[PDB]
């Protein structure tokens, strides 16, 4: 089994 | 389950050092670190085992890697750090551990972010507080022109606003 690296959020958008 | 337990955990030693770290495979990771100089080895995106551990919230692995010489200052290909990855997720205890190692806190990544801007964006109040106390600069801006207060205001994050403002109010006016 492999897990992915989470990507850093897009700071150009509201998180929701 | 054919045997007493699943066989999957016994196959875990074929995983890369990055996947061991990410998945919290402490025994196989420790053993792999003893036998080869691999603790700071990077994968194709320039990520170290510590980055993977931090990004996945593996507190025990992070502690183990730091206690065994893993370099917390390294940056990935996107100029990301273990600190910024953990700040993005609000992993407060990982962040604390890394900050206690004296890592830089204001490295501007190629995504236009810093640990503080990620902690603000995620509404992770404790991370924001800790970061400000370790010298994180709230005036640094995203690509769109948003500093930490701007993001906190625009996103409606009230506690983050208070935290940033208190901090700024603690700065002594220069009288020299």
**H-assigned helices in B13-156:** 17-23, 26-35, 49-55, 59-67, 82-89, 92-100, 115-121, 125-133, 148-155
Tokens of B13: 């030693």
For residues B65 and B49, the answer to whether their CB atoms sit within 8 Å is: yes
8 A C-beta contact, residue B23 and residue B52? no
B157 within 8 A of B123, measured Cβ to Cβ: yes
CATH number at residue B67: 1.25.40.20
Task: Answer yes or no: are the C-beta atoms of B66 and B33 closer than 8 Å.
Answer: no
Distance between CA atoms of residues B131 and B110, nearest Å: 20
If one counts every other C-beta atom within 10 angstroms of the C-beta of residue B116, the result is: 27
**Residues in B lying within 8 Å of A, measured between beta carbons:** 8, 15, 19, 22-23, 45, 47, 51-52, 55-56, 78, 80, 84-85, 88-89, 109, 111-113, 117-118, 121-123, 142-144, 146, 151, 154-155
Do B87 and B119 contact (CB within 8 A), yes or no? yes
Tokens 């930490």 -> residue: B148
Query: In whole angstroms, what is the distance from residue B120 CA to residue B147 CA?
Result: 10
Q: Identify the sign of the CA torsion B163, B165, B167, B169.
A: negative
Domain interval for residue B105: 1-176
Contact yes or no for B163/B125 (Cβ under 8 A): yes
Q: What DSSP element (H or E) covers B163?
A: helix B158-169
Q: Are B85 and B117 in contact (CB under 8 A)?
A: no
Structure tokens at B14: 């074929």
List the Cα angle B137/B141/B145 in 5-degree steps: 155
Domain total for chain B?
A: 1
Q: What is the largest CA-CA distance in chain A?
A: 33
């Amino acid at each position: 089994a492999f897990v992915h690296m989470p990507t850093l959020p897009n700071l150009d958008f509201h998180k929701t | 389950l054919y045997f007493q337990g699943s066989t999957t955990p016994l196959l875990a030693n074929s995983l890369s050092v990055h996947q061991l770290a990410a998945q919290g495979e402490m025994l196989y990771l420790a053993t792999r670190i003893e036998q080869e100089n691999v603790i700071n080895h990077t994968d194709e995106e320039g990520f170290t085992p510590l980055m993977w551990a931090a990004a996945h919230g593996q507190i025990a692995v992070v502690e183990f890697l730091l206690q065994n010489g893993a370099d917390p200052q390294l940056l990935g290909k996107g100029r990301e750090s273990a600190l910024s990855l953990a700040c993005s997720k609000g992993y407060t205890d990982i962040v604390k551990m890394l900050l206690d190692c004296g890592v830089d806190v204001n490295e501007y990544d190629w995504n236009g972010g810093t640990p503080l801007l990620y902690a603000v964006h995620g509404n992770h109040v404790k991370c924001v507080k800790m970061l400000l106390e370790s010298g994180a600069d709230p005036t640094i801006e995203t690509d769109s022109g948003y500093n930490s207060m701007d993001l906190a205001v625009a996103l409606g994050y009230r506690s983050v606003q208070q935290v940033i403002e208190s901090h700024l109010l603690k700065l002594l006016q220069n009288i020299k």
